[PDB]
What we know:
The complex is a heterotrimer. Chain A has one helix at residues 104-122, and strands at 6-20, 25-39, 45-51, 57-62, 70-72, 75-86, 93-101. By secondary structure, chain A is an alpha+beta fold. Chain A has one domain: Pleckstrin-homology domain (PH domain)/Phosphotyrosine-binding domain (PTB) (PH-domain like, Roll). In chain A, strand 3 (45-51) and strand 4 (57-62) form a beta hairpin. Chain A is globular, with a radius of gyration of 14 Å. In chain B, strands 2-3-1-4-5-6 form a six-stranded mixed beta sheet, sandwiched between helices. Chain B has helices at residues 16-24, 88-92, 94-104, 131-135, 152-162, 187-199; strands at 2-10, 38-47, 50-59, 78-84, 110-115, 138-141. Chain B is globular, with a radius of gyration of 20 Å. Chain C is an all-alpha fold. Chain C has one domain. Chain C contains 50 helices and two strands. Chain C has a two-stranded antiparallel ribbon with strand order 1-2. In chain C, helix 18 crosses helix 20 (339-352), helix 39 (745-766) runs antiparallel to helix 40 (774-787) and helix 45 runs parallel beside helix 47. The interface between B and C is large, with 52 and 51 residues. The structure holds guanosine-5'-triphosphate, chloride ion (4 copies) and magnesium ion (2 copies). Guanosine-5'-triphosphate is lined by residues 12-18, 29-32, 34-35, 60-62, 115-116, 118-119, 143-145 of chain B.
Amino acid sequence: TMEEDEEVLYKVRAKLFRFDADAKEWKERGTGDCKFLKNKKTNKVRILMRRDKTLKICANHIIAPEYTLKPNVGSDRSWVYACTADIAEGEAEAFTFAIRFGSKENADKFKEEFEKAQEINKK
Amino acid sequence: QVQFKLVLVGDGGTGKTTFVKRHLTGEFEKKYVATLGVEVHPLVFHTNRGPIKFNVWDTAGQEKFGGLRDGYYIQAQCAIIMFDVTSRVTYKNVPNWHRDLVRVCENIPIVLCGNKVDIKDRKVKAKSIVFHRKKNLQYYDISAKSNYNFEKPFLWLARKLIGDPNLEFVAMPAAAPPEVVMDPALAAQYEHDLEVAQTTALPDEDDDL
Amino acid sequence: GAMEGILDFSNDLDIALLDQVVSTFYQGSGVQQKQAQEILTKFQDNPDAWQKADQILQFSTNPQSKFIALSILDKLITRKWKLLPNDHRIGIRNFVVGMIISMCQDDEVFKTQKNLINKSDLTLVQILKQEWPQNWPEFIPELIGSSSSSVNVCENNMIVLKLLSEEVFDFSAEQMTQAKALHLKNSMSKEFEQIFKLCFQVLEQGSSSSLIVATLESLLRYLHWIPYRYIYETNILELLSTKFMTSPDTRAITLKCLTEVSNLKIPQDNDLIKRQTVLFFQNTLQQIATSVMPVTADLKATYANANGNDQSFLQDLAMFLTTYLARNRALLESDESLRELLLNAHQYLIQLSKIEERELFKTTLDYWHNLVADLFYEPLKKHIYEEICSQLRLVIIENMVRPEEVLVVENDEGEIVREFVKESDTIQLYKSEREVLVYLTHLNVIDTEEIMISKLARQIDGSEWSWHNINTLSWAIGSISGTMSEDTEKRFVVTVIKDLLGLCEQKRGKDNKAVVASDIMYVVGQYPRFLKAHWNFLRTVILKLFEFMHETHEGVQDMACDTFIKIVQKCKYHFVIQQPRESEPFIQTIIRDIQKTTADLQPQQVHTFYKACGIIISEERSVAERNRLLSDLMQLPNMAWDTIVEQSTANPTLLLDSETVKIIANIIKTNVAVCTSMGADFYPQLGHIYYNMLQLYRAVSSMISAQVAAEGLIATKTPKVRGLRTIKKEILKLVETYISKARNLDDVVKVLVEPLLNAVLEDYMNNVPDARDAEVLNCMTTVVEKVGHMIPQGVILILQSVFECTLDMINKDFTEYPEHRVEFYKLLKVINEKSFAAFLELPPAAFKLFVDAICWAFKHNNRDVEVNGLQIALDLVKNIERMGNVPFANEFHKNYFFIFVSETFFVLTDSDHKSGFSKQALLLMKLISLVYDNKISVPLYQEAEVPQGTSNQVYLSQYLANMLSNAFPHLTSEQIASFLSALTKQCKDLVVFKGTLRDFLVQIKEVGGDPTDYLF
Ligand SMILES: Nc1nc2c(ncn2[C@@H]2O[C@H](COP(=O)(O)OP(=O)(O)OP(=O)(O)O)[C@@H](O)[C@H]2O)c(=O)[nH]1
Ligand SMILES: [Cl-]
Ligand SMILES: [Cl-]
Ligand SMILES: [Cl-]
Ligand SMILES: [Cl-]
Ligand SMILES: [Mg+2]
Ligand SMILES: [Mg+2]
């Protein structure tokens, strides 16, 4: 699994989308638990999200300081951002992600933890 | 690694391609674009007996788009027969799909799947589905939309193809991912699409999640 | 690429190139495989590819090339065979027959290319379906003769007979005309004695060869249809029931043979045939016990291990025992010497019902239902199965699955969460177990109770405490409600809940408490008879449900509100009266602390709470008490409401606060919830808010349009506009809810409807499409349905506002605005049934769009739309005919009769709308019957096209003969004539009419269909 040298800073149930820029539509990537893992050797924090039942990785990237969470016009319980290097699906790729939660509270809680994780990755 | 050919058959519109695409990419395609002939798709699952690969042959259900028809079944090692619980006719032709299928594949594991069980107005109700009992098919209600039982057809086939009844899906290990820098030469391309992504609404905004 | 070369028929076909394309396709991958795919598809659908098939079969090195060559032939034989000259017909037969013999005589080819032999055999049978017996009388005799000269040939002939039986008896109903299937069935029946004898000889002179299995496989097919004498008056039952059970590779097919045997057509007044039916069962059970496993064996574990074919075999055994015993067990219940056989068979089923596999369990449970219903109605039988039923109770109780009421559930990690989805298959499994358990309790209520109380004892002291065991036990206890006496039930229930209350206080953690709470709530909800007679326990129950409404775990509070509703719809009387030893009717104590007890519920839980309160209040039938109980219940909603509308009508831009819009919606949703349970009785509360509510609708409307105009179409996706549209949809739903349940319909017409139509119709018609709510159509459907007969002009106004502009949204594809699409045809249906006069007030141009709108609904494959579309068409034809000989009806027929006839013909025949076949046929039959009963009083044809004296019958058959000839150019004129003749003669008999239509659907898929088929 590669998650025993790692602390879980934050867990929340969430659904993750990628923007298909040629079709102009959001497409689901996975539904499951989104985890903030902080490696105990490097103190680097990644997002790691697995689908329910298949446990397949649908998100695997460092929470980079540069990233910015931006709202999506249709939703108050979602964030959008551009990720430069995700490895959930083979070799690293760029993606525009959207992640949506069950609640406006969880979305805002994610946002604060997300930027707490950015502070950590700076240091 | 070892791989098995899987044929997926059933009437047009029953959700075969939706089901495959949900397993390939995680997405839920809402439009109906009838497939023409067959489209072949690798799909790998991680088990406690190593990785198992299915070469999924996703066939066409519409007769005009049928392509090579039973030609697609040759040397299939397993199969999924798909019908739609909101459409009685697609359950009525399940014995026709099974007929063509087993004339070419005499002794393979086969799942019967009644899809779309998430729709409230269900027409083929769970008492009427009995065709699998005498043909030794495994049967599952599924919903590619709600993902209800959506992994069980593959987990059942994996158990019978490997010959281990205790086979379970397991968490694939997650490599430590990199730290890549952004570049301003390709950014104004991505930041138009970042902008368009913010102004394109997310589907299904009344869902629980 | 080089691979495209095979599609150029200018040259000789390169066989090596084909085989590589084929190899690329099957064994390759990626885009080469995908390129190869489309090349072989084009190759295969080329109309002259069949001419190459002789060449490929000779010189190809590739089995699957040859398979594909046969597929091309296959499609030639099944569709255009009869136009070939006979030079090519007999030639194709000759090289198909020769290829089969050639492959059978080479033993390594017979061993290795089973797929390709099987496909050749199927291709031969497609030749038989068109030539035999009339142009091949010799086939069955020669086949029989050829069998004795070679064993590979003998075995292959069993495969050909097996497939031929299948195509003629098992799959002919859909794919042949009635007359051709009747012709091929008679032909096999006359030649079967020659066939059965060859099959009988093979089985006696041979043990467990692959020739034996192939013969048994063909026998399984013959058993679907052959006369009983071939099974009972030969020795074949003894062979099947003893010899072919010992060998494990004939055992599976024999067991399927004997299952079909346990279903033949058999005389019931013949004790020798009865003796044979007993004996083959006794022989089979004998062979299983000594060769496979004994009665004591743990089939649960055998099935779990999944060695070899053990799973398939246990399934086939379960199917054998339940088929045989459901029909023949009474042959075993009288004779004392067959009692051991009877119970050993059922003992095997008891062991089968322990297998942990749901579909197998459903198979045995259906048999157990069949058995225990019989024991409950049939005299003097239940004592035979006393021990069987006693173990059957244990099995069912220990494998109860979760009922729909129970919302908490264990997940993969092993914590208790609220359930995400409704599991419809397990809901059905629960009811099936309930029905069997209910019967088993009646057969011995003392045993059932003893099992259950002693299981509960071992949950309290912990010696087998588990989530699984407390659940299954609780669910079984709930499912047997009503099976006990009122006295036994009272002792039983008091015990069970006092003990369950014990467990809940004892165990630690919110997971254990959530489990025991869901069990308590399931039990109490299932025993209202007990709750009604014991107000002490009812009120502790209700108060305990109020405690569960304060739990952190959201699954537990949801179930408390649903259990409260479930108890209250059966016990409402005991809340509305004042009980002895109390201050008040309990309802007013409930309404009193309604804010405190609902404090930690989320909004839709509280709305359920108010709906339960509404159920109670409606039991009170004095108008004064109920009107004020209602007023007291709605005090929090009305309080909040009054402060919101005083603010909004003073300053119309205070509403934009998104927390105000959620306040407004939950207020209206509380009214919807309460009106759902009170119906007509809701009317006083509705009036208190109605005019202000319609003003807030118009106010919210302006803001929606203002924001679309300011921000664009995307504004309909924002949270702010979605929230304000929620307010409109909840307002419509409240009004739709009241009107559907209303008693006083003049108050509806005099008070409700005119303010409603003014508030919603113009706003719908004048919004842009993405801003119109389909809920408006839904609301109008209820208005027309209930009061339409009292408001003709309002129905006109409804038509004009919504009809054309919504038709414009849904009439360019089948996909966009899917819920508008459905509510629109619902609305046209009810207008056309209850207020057809409104369509008469449409201008001719709008009546044409109406007719266009109907035929549009035919072509959908969204079955909500087409059944209403076909229904409207049938109802419109009914409406026109009641008018009689008047100008509007005669004009309708001249303008639309043939549009309706051809549009339903098109969807009958295009192979894309087969789910509406029955209503299509009914509509078409009604249309044809009008002409043949002379119910159209003017000529349908325009004048100077046919002589003036000619009838509509005569012109109708010309019109249809011409319309069919151009749409189906490959039909002969005689085919079309005979079809229309039969079609018009049968136009009062729906079932025969439909058979003629299906016969036609067969013939249009082929060339040269026999016209005399339509005299069947
Ligand atoms: N509600 C619901 N809709 C579904 C479900 N699965 C599929 N659909 C829809 O049904 C349609 C099925 O389309 P496909 O999946 O392309 O159908 P198909 O079986 O591949 O059709 P052919 O390729 O013609 O054989 C799509 O619109 C899906 O969005 C489901 O579980 N629930
Ligand atoms: Cl082959
Ligand atoms: Cl005989
Ligand atoms: Cl009552
Ligand atoms: Cl003719
Ligand atoms: Mg498809
Ligand atoms: Mg690194």
